[PDB]
Amino acid sequence: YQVVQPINGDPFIGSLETPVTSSPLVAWYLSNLPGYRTAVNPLLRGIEVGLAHGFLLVGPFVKAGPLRNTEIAGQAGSLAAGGLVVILSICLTIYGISSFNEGDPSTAPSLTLTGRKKQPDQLQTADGWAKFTGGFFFGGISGVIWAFFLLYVLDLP
Amino acid sequence: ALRFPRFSQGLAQDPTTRRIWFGIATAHDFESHDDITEGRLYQNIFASHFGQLAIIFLWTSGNLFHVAWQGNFEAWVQDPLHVRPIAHAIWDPHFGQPAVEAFTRGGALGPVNIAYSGVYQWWYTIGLRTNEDLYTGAIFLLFLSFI
Amino acid sequence: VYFDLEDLGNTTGQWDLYGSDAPSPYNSLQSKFFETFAAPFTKRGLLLKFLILGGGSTLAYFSATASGDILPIKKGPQLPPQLGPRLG
């Protein structure tokens, strides 16, 4: 008995199957992250990714920024997080402009790990990525606003 | 052609990042570009010379402007050996309060850098006396860079 | 088989390892909320202009209207100026 097996039974594809790669917990959890929901409108997946990251980014900027000890304005350091979301929404935007063209189809795989044919994820399409950037921006600024909305009764505010 | 760099097909057909680097490092090597002739060679050189002259005039124009705006030229003429000439003003939002304190010198309101190019002595020796004279020279060189 | 000149996506491993392909877990109403309010942001060209200009004007506003209580560069020097090694 052995634990490490070739990637999907093919030894000549550059990868391996390990508990980190191929495991029911890892496979399910990654299959349930919004970036891997290959049948959902990319606008909504962008909303979730934007909400999670915009919410997370507020913490470090507020607690480590220059105005951190000047409590008069340190709570407004979420603006820096919001500015990074703006910058990242530009990085996301300019990425799709160069990667996918208007009439180009999806570059995502049109297969399944079991061989059956599949409908490619619309995220690797020009309009799909545009919806994801718009969703990430909307959820991003919403995540920063909602994170700054909370401030009190926390051990590290 | 087909993509950057438009002057080199072999660089444009590079599938790696090497396409970008060599496209920048060979922009002025006119003789290696595709479909170059002796006429296009001398003509691109001629226009590059004009662009350089425009760069030089604009650069000197900016130097006059800051000396006349944030500088010490009018005060430096009165005390040539007791006034530290000012290059320009410093506006760095990363400055702490002491950085603003220690960099405020030469008799200015904010932090300034002490000029060490000698344009103050040069301009005083040739007849320039007021900040208005430096503004006039800057406009003329800005206009010369334009032509 | 693993080598099939017909389908090279299966031959070269062009698979979706962690794609779910399941229907949407996001319920309705909520999705329509985001699909109508995040609608104008999904034009990548318009979003690019909106981000650059909007972000640049936001940066220009908070920089032009800065405060001396927040930035030492605007507060300026509060101490009397020092004296150079020989000059002013």
Binding site: - | F4 | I52, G55, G56, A60, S63
Partner: peptide, 30 residues
């Protein structure tokens, strides 16, 4: 007051627009 407008306009906005536009041109295809 003018530095509070032009210093970010050349150290933040200008490199942002310049790097993004050069990225689009370099990665463009015909």
């Amino acid at each position: 007051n003018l530095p509070s407008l032009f210093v970010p306009l050349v150290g933040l906005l200008f490199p942002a627009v310049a790097m993004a536009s050069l990225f689009l041109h370099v990665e463009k295809r015909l």
